[PDB]
Design an enzyme around this catalytic site. Structure first.
Site, PDB file in Angstrom:
ATOM      1  N   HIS A 271       0.794  -1.223   0.000  1.00  0.00           N
ATOM      2  CA  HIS A 271       0.000   0.000   0.000  1.00  0.00           C
ATOM      3  C   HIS A 271       0.837   1.288   0.000  1.00  0.00           C
ATOM      4  O   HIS A 271       0.553   2.253  -0.725  1.00  0.00           O
ATOM      5  CB  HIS A 271      -0.971  -0.004   1.205  1.00  0.00           C
TER       6      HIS A 271
ATOM      7  N   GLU B 230       6.863   0.302   6.307  1.00  0.00           N
ATOM      8  CA  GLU B 230       7.728   0.490   5.133  1.00  0.00           C
ATOM      9  C   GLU B 230       7.600   1.878   4.514  1.00  0.00           C
ATOM     10  O   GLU B 230       6.682   2.137   3.727  1.00  0.00           O
ATOM     11  CB  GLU B 230       7.335  -0.593   4.112  1.00  0.00           C
TER      12      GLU B 230
END
Length: 239
Positions: free
Chosen positions: A84, A156
């Site tokens: 995402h 991330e």
């Protein structure tokens, strides 16, 4: 104590990959850890035919539609990785969409690696905590308590992705720490304590240990270095 760690390879030539799988297969893993090999669809027959290691699993990337999901299921794929954080950053994909996704896969019985994080620009402007919290919340919005059993979180940050700029163990611990508390409070301390929160972005065999020594880090999500043999060093770092 820390829940069972996860070391994910986030996926070249068949040849090269095969030599990797050969390498992996030959590896001795003396601890409880769960290895995963995420790859594009097209490589699924192969990896699946070659990967033999008891501690390894295979997963796809970004699988959407009800249909896709069915065939993966019907192909022997049980894990997913939803990037995402990158989609959001480059293409402006909404937090609403990754949430329907997690929700959907979770319902189909998949194990889900949801990738979340902030952009360089948010990082700078001190907009991190907000952005992140906002992402995890959207996700939360569509899951029942029991659904968390199939969920893995991957912190991330866009900026550490293929840059060589790896978060410091500090920055990492902090975001990991932030996500955990939100879960604890909003969902349960049970859920929380058993949640796997992985770090992703420029992880390497040289840097991995120190990131793992951190209290709220449960493993890594590995791109680049997961294409080198050094990935093993990273599996071993999870102890």
């Amino acid at each position: 104590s820390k829940p069972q760690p996860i070391a994910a390879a986030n996926w070249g030539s068949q040849q090269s990959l095969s030599e990797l799988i050969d390498l992996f297969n030959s590896t001795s893993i003396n601890h409880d850890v769960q290895c995963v090999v995420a790859s594009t669809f097209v490589h699924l027959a192969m990896t699946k035919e070659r990967l033999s290691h008891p501690k390894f699993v295979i997963a796809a990337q970004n699988a959407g539609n009800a249909d896709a999901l069915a065939s993966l299921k019907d192909f022997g794929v049980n894990w997913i990785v939803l990037g995402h954080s990158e989609r959001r950053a480059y293409y402006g994909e909404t937090n609403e969409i990754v949430a329907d996704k997690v929700a959907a896969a979770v319902a189909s019985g998949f194990m889900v690696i949801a990738c979340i994080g902030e952009t360089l620009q948010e990082r700078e402007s001190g907009r991190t905590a907000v952005v992140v919290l906002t992402q995890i919340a959207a996700i939360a919005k569509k899951l029942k308590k029991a659904d968390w059993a199939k969920v893995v979180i991957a912190y991330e940050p866009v900026w550490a992705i293929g840059t060589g700029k790896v978060a410091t163990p500090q920055q990492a611990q902090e975001a990991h720490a932030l996500i955990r508390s939100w879960v604890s409070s909003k969902i349960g301390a049970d859920v929380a304590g058993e949640l796997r929160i992985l770090y992703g972005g420029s992880v390497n065999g040289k840097n991995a240990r120190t990131l793992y020594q951190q209290r709220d880090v449960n493993g890594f999500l590995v791109g680049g270095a997961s294409l080198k043999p050094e990935f093993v060093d990273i599996i071993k770092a999870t102890q």
